[PDB]
Amino acid sequence: YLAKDMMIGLGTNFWANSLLVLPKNEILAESEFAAPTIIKLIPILFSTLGAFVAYNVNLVADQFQRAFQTSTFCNRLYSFFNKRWFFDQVLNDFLV
Amino acid sequence: GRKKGLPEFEESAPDGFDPENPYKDPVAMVEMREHIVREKWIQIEKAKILREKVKWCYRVEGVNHYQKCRHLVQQYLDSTRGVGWGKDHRPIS
Amino acid sequence: RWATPGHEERPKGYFMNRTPPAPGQSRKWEDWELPCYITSFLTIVILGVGLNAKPDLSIETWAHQKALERLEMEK
Amino acid sequence: KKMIATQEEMSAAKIALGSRDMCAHLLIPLNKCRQAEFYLPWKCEDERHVYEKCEYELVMERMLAMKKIREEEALAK
Amino acid sequence: GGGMETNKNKFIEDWGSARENLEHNFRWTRRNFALIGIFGIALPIIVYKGIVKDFHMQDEDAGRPHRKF
Amino acid sequence: GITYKGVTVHTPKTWHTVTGKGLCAVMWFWILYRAKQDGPVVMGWRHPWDG
Amino acid sequence: MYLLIVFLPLLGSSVAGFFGRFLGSEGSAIMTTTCVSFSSILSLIAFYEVALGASACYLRIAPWISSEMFDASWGFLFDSLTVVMLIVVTFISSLV
Amino acid sequence: FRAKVWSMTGGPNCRPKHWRRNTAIAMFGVFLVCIPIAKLSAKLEQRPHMPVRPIPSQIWCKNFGTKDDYEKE
Amino acid sequence: YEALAWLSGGLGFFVGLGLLAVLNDKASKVPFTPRVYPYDNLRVELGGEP
Amino acid sequence: YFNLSGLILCPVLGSIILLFIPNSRIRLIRLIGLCASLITFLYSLVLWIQFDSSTAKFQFVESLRWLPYENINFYLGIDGISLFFVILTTFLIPICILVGWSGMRSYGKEYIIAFLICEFLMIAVFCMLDLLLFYVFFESVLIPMFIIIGVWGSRQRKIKAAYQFFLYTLLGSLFMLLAILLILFQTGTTDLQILLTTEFSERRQIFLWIAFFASFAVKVPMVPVHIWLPEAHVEAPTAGSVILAGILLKFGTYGFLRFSIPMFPEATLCFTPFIYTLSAIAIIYTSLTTLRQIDLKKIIAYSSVAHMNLVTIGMFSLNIQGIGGSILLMLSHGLVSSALFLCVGVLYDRHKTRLVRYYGGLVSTMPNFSTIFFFFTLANMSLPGTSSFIGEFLILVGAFQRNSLVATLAALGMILGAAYSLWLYNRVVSGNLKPDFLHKFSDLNGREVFIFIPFLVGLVWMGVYPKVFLDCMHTSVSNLVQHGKFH
Ligand SMILES: CCCCCCCCCCCCCCCCCC(=O)O[C@@H](COC(=O)CCCCCCCCCCCCCCC)COP(=O)(O)OCC[N+](C)(C)C
Ligand SMILES: CCCCCCCCCCCCCCCCCCCC(=O)O[C@H](COC(=O)CCCCCCCCCCCCCC)COP(=O)(O)OCCN
Predict the structure, then answer these.
(1) Which residues form a coiled coil (chain I)?
(2) Looking at CA atoms only, how far is residue C51 from chain B in angstroms?
């Protein structure tokens, strides 16, 4: 709250030469006065949806939503993101 | 066995060296070779001093340095065309 | 535990693994130490009051003064 | 609305580039009062809302200018 | 337990003083020819051609004719 | 904390509960404090600063 | 004063490492942290005198690489952008 | 065997008896050598800008508001 | 070797979703006009000649 | 009047006195040898005081006749470049005496004879303007190094190590001698001042440049010929092996500066891509070869090979800053490689394994050695703040300004330098301690602790303030770059 106004305030005069922004690519005022109000407050909506789904999966609805003992393509989905896209595997073997 | 002041070798020109036959007077060719560097270092040093001119200009003016240092920016950019031995565009000395 | 004295009579280990002798006598300097030490002192003094006694004559300060008196001739 | 602060008063002021749009004459008092007031968001508001509405007017006239192109493009199709 | 030197294990001595002399192994084999012809005559030639091409392109931008080298 | 059949939990110290409560209540109050004064800023209705 | 912002942590580290046997496991803990907190206070002072009192501070200690027209110097740029990160680094370092 | 090795940066749990005495000397040692750093810097810190409000660094400094022109560097 | 097959798909989603941002052409969907400054778009204070 | 003659005479007097000293008087031999070496070091240092870094011509010169018609003669002198090499040569040798100080009883007085002989021998190389006698003293260092490698070699396989180091050198030496004969027969003399002012034939320029490159590509390890250095360098005593990478490795690289670049201005330009395509692939191939190595000595030698191949790029890139950076890198390498071989030799003098497999967890003990080793590894790791980084940054700057491709390959060298040196450091003195092999071991005593002090102080001094080194030789580098051309 203290730094919202003083340093991002549509042309605050303390930066001076520290940070220079070209005239052409300066889109700040229309980032606040042209907001559709249907997009500015949407990440709160994804946040509350994530809250709902996380609470449901990890507190109550975990009988099937937690462990997936399917046949194929689901264990490998678990491994793909656990091993972070196999970067530590492909990069290692193919370069070092 | 020197004076306490800065040395001064020679400034005008080496008379012995003739460009038409560079290897004709070996005694005077080394004089021309050393005179070339002793005169190119002058240009390098004045480039350095104009660089500090520009640097202090940017350090004083503020946000209006795109309209109050252009007379020195053009004095820097053209001074790098033939300064020292740094880029393949060697100066025509 | 900020008030209790430490449980150490002496810092552990020996400096350069050289066991101190009985109290009262010196360290019994070794043959190489004295010439090497005096040469180190001579090196320090020569590089100290010799380097900061050589006049600054070079291709940098001479060119600096020359270009300072030559850039001023624009007219 | 046309600007009045030009040349010396605009250049002597330390306003940064990019915020030097059509209506920026009143930014000098805003930054003079804001700088001495510790940059408190809850202490400088007399000179702020005028600038906020000036930028409001600039944005809405900017979209008004595009309204004409948007409603005239139907001729091409 | 008064020996400052290492024990010099038998299985490590051969590993040490075997890679020191690989002339007997690396005399004549099929993979050696491919490796040498792809990494001692191929890569140096490619990088030399790249360097001379870079020099030529630098010359062209300045306009001066390229040196024979 | 009272001891059980394996969980002999130790109760938190005096200053490790009241300090937490009285510091978190500040944030809880501050959320609504910024939702009342500067709240009308980002809602799409009643834009402040001369609006 | 501006040199004290940078050199005090180095001095504390050097003296702690060289004389970590003279100081116990708590002497270095109370000494290096005190030096870093002093540096943080210096950074806060610089922020007050630069960020709000907008006048950047410039300096040059000695030439590092004094080759031809390749002037490298030990100078620092106590600028408005820099002092914010001075606060960020010093406060967090002292707290850590 | 830890007591045999010197461990110049201090042993694992090196706890000298008079560690407070050494820490007092060490802290005093930093302060006495910090003054030359502060004193030598007083001939430095060139800031041609003049702040809108007075800072507390005018007593030990004078390199502000003087280096205005850039035609005689 | 099976990891490389997953590697191609993983980066393919990124570039594939990158191309989809070209198929909508949000550049022409601006609800306003390009910003304009006085004095030839501030020519004197951005370079050029005085 | 501290001229160059005394600087060469003093080691000769030291050697002569040592010749007639009985073997029993082991107390006096080491003392007088070390005193002679230190007097030589101080006599070299005092030259830096009276250097007068202003003139393009040469400093104190001594002329002694060598032929009946004064055709060619001993003509001493330094200009701006060999001065630092003379200082570092005079500084490394007392370290050589100090490192081999404890075990002098077995070595005898013959150990110091060879070192002092090589001492004034390498002194007479750097300050030798006459071209032919520069070759006489350039190959005179064969005998002392041959003797040091053979007589006091560590293992019995030293017989084959010395043969390569000898014959590889002789081949290029005689190939250079043929070029020297061609130059003398054509010009008439071999004095450097005159011979630099003779109009050569372009067809003759290429052949003579190749003939010089025949040997100068052996002293600096190049791609075709670098086998001798590891095999003949792992198998030398620590006091002796520390100058194969100390001064014996800087002859050919420095020989390029004095007898190739200003000598053949029109041939180096025509052969520039060849040197680039050799050194750029050398810094890659040797660095990759370094990774899969087990011996502790060979890795440091390979890193030295990579450093020399890097400095060769910056030397042939004719720039006022490229050559200065080359000299700074060569001095810094002479310091750091010497320090690294002492660091890896003090381990050998206690355990005698020379294998990284046995070494491990040497931070839990001998921490001072661990700190010194870490500092010198960082210096070899090419960090800013040390003298090396000043060394290769100017090399990269000089290379990029001329050719963009070569700079990227050269900087691949300092990228790959973090793969073997850091791995060695973490695999030798930061692993898990094993009592099976290293049953017992001590730490550095007062000798090797003081040995690294000059190395550390010089390293930091030339890393944080390299101004004096660059200040003393800006004139000479300027004169060397601007030669033959007049624009
Ligand atoms: C980019 C290069 C800049 C210059 C390089 C110096 C920067 C610091 C590099 C050294 C940092 C410390 C690394 C030392 C080795 C670490 C491993 C080690 O050997 O530890 C030793 C050494 O310990 C140290 O870390 C000593 C640190 C000394 C370095 C202090 C100087 C750093 C600041 C100097 C920077 C230059 C200032 C500018 C100069 C103009 C002992 O540690 P112990 O706690 O006793 O544990 C050992 C286990 N046992 C007790 C059982 C034996
Ligand atoms: C553990 C105990 C070790 C004791 C050593 C000292 C303890 C401190 C160690 C910390 C490291 C300090 C290293 C010195 C850093 C000095 C950095 C600035 C040096 C510098 O550039 O200024 C020069 C000062 O001259 C001088 O006086 C420099 C004298 C330095 C003497 C160092 C002797 C090392 C000898 C090693 C020889 C190796 C040879 C290798 C080739 C002259 O600068 P200037 O030209 O601008 O003059 C000015 C004229 N206006």
Answers:
(1) none
(2) 16
CA dihedral B78, B82, B88, B92 (to 10 degrees): 130
Cβ contact J280:J409 at 8 Å = yes
Task: State the DSSP code for H5.
Answer: S
This structure's resolution (Å) is 3.5
Top mutation candidate among J332, J343, J363, J464 for ligand 1, by most atoms within 8 Å of CB: J363
- Could you tell me which residues are beta bridge partners of residue J257? none
Map residue J325 onto helix, strand or coil.
helix
Cα–Cα distance for residue pair B29/B22, rounded to 1 Å? 7
Q: What distance in Å separates the CA atoms of residue C6 and residue C20, rounded to the nearest whole number?
A: 23
Instruction: Report CA Rg, chain F.
Output: 21
C-alpha G31/C-alpha G24 separation (Å) is: 11
Cα separation, G14 vs G12, whole angstroms: 5
Interface contact flag, B57 H70, Cβ < 8 Å: yes
J11 within 8 A of J119, measured Cβ to Cβ: yes
Experimental method: cryo-EM
Beta bridge partners of C63: none
Report CA Rg, chain C.
28
Distance CA D59, CA F13 (A): 57
Query: DSSP H helical segments within chain B, as ranges?
Result: 26-58, 70-77
Find the helix packing angle between G2-18 and G27-47, rounded to 10°.
170
Please give the DSSP secondary-structure letter assigned to residue D74. G
Number of neighbours of residue B25 by Cβ within 10 angstroms: 17
* Nearest ligand to the CA atom of J89: 2
Q: Report the phi/psi class of residue H32: left, alpha or beta, with left for phi > 0 and alpha for psi in -120 to 50.
A: alpha
Q: Which residues of chain G does B60 touch, with a Cβ-Cβ cutoff of 8 Å?
A: none
CA A74 to chain centre: 24
**Rounded alpha-carbon distances, angstroms, from residue E39 to E35, J158, J337:** 6, 32, 29
Collect all residues with Cβ–Cβ distance below 8 Å to J251 and sequence separation of at least 6: J125, J138, J141, J219
Residues J364, J435: contact at Cβ < 8 Å?
A: no
Q: How far is C23 from chain H (nearest CA, A)?
A: 20
Interface test with D, best of B63, B67, B68 (most D CBs within 10 A): B63
Helix (H, G, I), strand (E, B) or coil at A38: coil
- Per-residue burial over I27-49, b if 16 or more Cβ lie within 10 Å, else e, is eeeeebeebebeeeebebbbeee
List H residues 32-51 in contact with G (Cβ-Cβ < 8 A). Answer: 33-34, 37-38, 40-41, 44-47, 49-51
Phi, psi of G54 (to 5 degrees): -65, 95
* Residue E2, CA distances (Å) to E5, J353, J435, J438, J440 in order: 9, 17, 13, 11, 8
Which residues approach ligand 1 with their CB closer than 6 A?
A: G 10, 13-14, 17; H 2, 5, 7, 9, 11-12; J 363-364, 367, 370-371, 374-375, 378, 383, 385-386, 460, 464
Distance of CA J193 to the CA centre of its chain: 25
Find, among J441, J453, J485, J483, the residue nearest to J192 by Cα. J483
Half-sphere exposure of J432 (CA within 13 A, CB side): 2
Kindly report the nearest CA distance between residue G54 and chain A, in angstroms.
Answer: 6
Neighbors of chain A with 3 or more C-beta pairs under 8 Å: B, D, F, G, I
The closest of A35, B10, F36 to J56, measured between CA atoms, is B10
Q: List the single best residue of G60, G64, G67 to mutate versus J (max J Cβ within 10 A).
A: G67
Decide if I37 and D20 are in contact by the 8 Å CB cutoff: yes
Residues in E 8-27 with any Cβ partner in B closer than 8 A: none
Give the integer Cα–Cα distance in Å for J250 and J334. 8
Q: For residue B6, count CB atoms less than 10 angstroms from its CB and return exposed for 0-12, middle for 13-18, buried for 19 or more.
A: middle
Nearest CA to ligand 1 atom 38: G10
